[PDB]
Design an enzyme around this catalytic site. Structure first.
Site, PDB file in Angstrom:
ATOM      1  N   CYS A 111      50.414 -39.918  -4.188  1.00  0.00           N
ATOM      2  CA  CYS A 111      50.878 -39.787  -5.571  1.00  0.00           C
ATOM      3  C   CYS A 111      49.595 -39.806  -6.382  1.00  0.00           C
ATOM      4  CB  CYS A 111      51.695 -41.027  -5.964  1.00  0.00           C
ATOM      5  SG  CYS A 111      52.979 -40.900  -7.261  1.00  0.00           S
ATOM      6  N   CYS A 164      56.491 -43.640  -5.085  1.00  0.00           N
ATOM      7  CA  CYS A 164      55.982 -43.528  -6.448  1.00  0.00           C
ATOM      8  C   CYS A 164      56.642 -42.305  -7.066  1.00  0.00           C
ATOM      9  CB  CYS A 164      54.457 -43.396  -6.372  1.00  0.00           C
ATOM     10  SG  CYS A 164      53.411 -42.836  -7.766  1.00  0.00           S
TER      11      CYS A 164
END
EC number: 2.8.1.13
Length: 365
Positions: free
Chosen positions: A99, A196
């Site tokens: 992420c 995430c």
RNA sequence: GUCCCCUUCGUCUAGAGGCCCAGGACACCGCCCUUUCACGGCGGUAACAGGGGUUCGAAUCCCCUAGGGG
């Protein structure tokens, strides 16, 4: 001397305070918010939007222009996408571990100066930055048990120098506390969890939304059928849940654990005891090498390495195994080192950057 | 088509008259933990094949119908 900082906000206290922190420090603060996941259904989406509110609401109670973005595009493409094949190949990828490399730090930062026209950037990340010898180094931040360095191992000083991390200077408690005394809506809000950008939810069903289930058979270290299998990419070395086993005559009366996946034959070697030999290892070989230092690593190193977020610094020795590959050697043995997961090495407060586990170094036994 | 021994929570079982409205472990479930997946911690649900006897008392005694035994 008062510069422009863009604190990414993910509706969490962390980000929140983090900003109010810069604010106090002076920096012209301006927050942003990323919509990076095309909501599955609604019960979640609901949330998604909600967060944004808490997002805004914070910037508002502070006086900061909250922006918006839809990197959802990149995310899936540069992140989720891979995250899949990896699992498809019966390995365990750390979505979040990227992420940051593709979205949160590359993408974000890009769209930070090219649009939002900012110099410095800031995440809620409870980690820490320190400049020395003219290069930005990545630190952990007080309260190691509550540190996040592990995920930003892909980051590379150039990227770091450009970012700021307020909180990594504080102690997790303070954080919430401050926000409380500040009236910030976020204070007293469960610290997220799960991939995430994607909501925390029962895995099994989620992965099932992108891959089919071929229920093989659960074998045993002693080579003998025992349990079903209902799929396969739903497990990972050392896992203990979802195995049904209830032990028999010859059973250490102890829990059973994964200990090797048999991709092709589509089996599933299971042992008994969170300590069984087939469960431990003495090192590994890591590819996808990223050094915070972003400088060529040849020769040999002496340090520590985590093998899963929040594991525990395990002294080890690193030999420059190859092109990118590296052979790590645990001082003692390690419990369920799982390939795909990322191995991060630290030299004290400093996280030097890790890499992807690709080879498990079996125990002699 | 004669005399023997077996039957316990989902599973493996503790239990040989009252201390068992049945205990443990593993599983299953839940909370805690936690920006991956997992580990871990703390808790919770759930069983005496079924029907009669005998005893003040029965999972454990006898007796009947459904699983293995020269």
């Amino acid at each position: 001397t008062a510069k422009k900082v863009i604190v990414g906000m993910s509706g969490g206290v962390d980000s929140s305070v983090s900003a109010w922190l810069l604010q106090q420090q002076g920096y012209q603060v301006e927050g942003l918010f990323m919509k990076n996941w095309e909501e599955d259904d609604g019960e979640e989406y609901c949330t998604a939007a909600a967060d944004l509110a808490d997002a805004q609401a914070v910037c508002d109670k502070l006086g900061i222009e909250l922006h918006t973005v839809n990197f959802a595009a990149e995310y899936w493409d540069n992140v989720f996408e891979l995250f899949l094949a990896e699992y498809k190949a019966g390995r365990t990828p750390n979505p979040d571990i990227l992420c940051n490399k593709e979205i949160k730090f590359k993408a974000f930062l890009e769209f930070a100066a090219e649009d939002l026209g900012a110099d410095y950037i800031a995440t809620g990340h409870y980690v820490r930055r320190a400049d020395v010898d003219g290069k930005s180094r990545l630190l952990r931040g007080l309260d190691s048990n509550k540190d996040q360095s592990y995920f930003l191992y892909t980051l590379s000083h150039e990227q770091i120098a450009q970012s700021l991390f307020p909180v990594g200077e504080l102690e997790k408690p303070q954080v919430r506390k401050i926000a409380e005394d500040l009236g910030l809506v976020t204070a007293k809000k469960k610290d997220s969890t799960g991939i995430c950008f994607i909501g925390e939810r029962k895995f099994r069903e989620f992965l099932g939304r992108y891959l089919p289930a071929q229920p093989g058979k659960i074998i045993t270290v002693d080579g003998d059928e025992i349990g079903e299998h209902q799929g396969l990419m739903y497990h990972t070395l050392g896992q203990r849940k979802g195995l049904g086993i209830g032990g028999t005559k010859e059973g250490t009366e102890e829990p059973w654990y994964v200990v090797d996946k048999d991709v092709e034959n589509n089996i599933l070697v299971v042992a008994q005891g969170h300590e069984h030999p087939r469960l431990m290892s003495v090192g590994l070989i890591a590819q996808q090498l990223h050094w915070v230092d972003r400088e060529p690593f040849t020769g040999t190193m002496r340090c520590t390495v985590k093998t899963r977020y929040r594991q525990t610094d395990i002294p080890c020795t690193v030999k420059a195994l190859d092109d990118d590959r590296i052979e790590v050697i645990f001082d003692e043995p390690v419990a369920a080192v799982t390939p795909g997961q990322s191995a991060v090495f630290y030299n004290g407060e400093v996280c030097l950057g890790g890499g992807i586990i690709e080879q498990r170094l079996p125990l002699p036994v």
